[PDB]
Amino acid sequence: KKRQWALEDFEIGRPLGKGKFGNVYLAREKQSKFILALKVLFKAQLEKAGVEHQLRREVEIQSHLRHPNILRLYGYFHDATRVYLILEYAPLGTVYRELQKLSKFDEQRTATYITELANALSYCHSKRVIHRDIKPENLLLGSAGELKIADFGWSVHAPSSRRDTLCGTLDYLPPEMIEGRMHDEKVDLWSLGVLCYEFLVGKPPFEANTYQETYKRISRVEFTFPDFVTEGARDLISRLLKHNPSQRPMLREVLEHPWITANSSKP
Template structure:
């Protein structure tokens, strides 16, 4: 099965659906410069949070170039006028959201992402809306989509050192999410961005859920990344993210998901039987990590602490301990 890789810039899913008229960009004398305002000190970011207690509007921003197009709208580079702070402004059309019946999903996404504070999770600074659009004020990730970065590599895959770095950062971010009772449920390269320094950022929480009860039954996410319990229609918990982490590690190292097949039904079969095959270039330590994550039974999967302490992570990263605790 050929995986359909969508452009998910800033969390907006790409689509061939016709786009509405874009926002008008600022004049040439006022165009947002990406290099200007990227020194993200706490004063600038905190000023956005303080401002959010008031009422935001489009008048607060200078609009720059488009960063991505999607089914429900577009993402633009923007600068908050008073602080000069660079952000990504995600613009969604209410009519498209209503037509697809995803207003509740967007509300949940905003509620979850706005309360997360971690260096490997894209910040949602605030939101506002008018009669036609909803606007999300997001952290700007200058190096863009991790999927595009991967596609630009030889053989469309990362080497083991780079893969280990990303898996370590993602494991840290997911560990933080799970402490907040947040299950992501849609980890894949298209939902990950890169900061100016090349650090991974989880950018899309469209399928995430806050689940204190820890048992869900909704079938969601991307086919190639679905765990057996979802495919088999069973209840699931935060351990679905462990499976996705294993699938992601495989795609980083091999350039494609591990259970890819000619048809959806064949992919389902390979997932349920955990039909895992490794190319010869993958190291034994990397195989060991993936085998321990890609277990049919959720309770048998390696924990996130186990991932962070795994010899493969330790081999390629200077510090396998967790990152410093994020701000409350």
């Protein structure tokens, strides 16, 4: 914003998470008593990994996004050693931990998460921003249990040519991305299909024991449903996981989906 913060402005609390490049802490701003989360990253690690520009990309995009379903970035600042991102704080945790805890979601919590998500993504895409990292570990919970997309680390503007050496799990990545081609916002809808399935089933539909094998699964779009996935969930997920991006529906079609409406508690 208009202001320049510094570490001495904040009391750091209990650590929320420990990433590869740094950790997230609860923290309070001394003068306002304001509660939020401080993301501490290391110039050393960011440098060695050559992500500095991608970090820039994160800060710009996220800082400029306002939406109930997106985690706000208020600002940032650096010192000799590390980099500090000042983030809105989501008091109920990741969707990942919800999923470990419950191991499966009912159609209603899933349709709801999928709705909030679709809305969020909608807002993003209207700006030509594609997230590309949508996974439950990157999804957080607000005071009211409402879903918030955090961690804009891999997002970019569309279309993208990006071949970025793929670091983590392919589990949420569409064929066009793993295969090194150019991609557009449809990426996120593929991901939404992956997410939907993981929410209902407890594991992402392409899970394998090796990168190479999972990569095969995604490329050939090989998945199957447990018997307890209702036909409506199957239809939404099947429409969402299409080798052809242009065959994948649009967030309007998702929000307007019969299964979504018969289930979601949130418009």
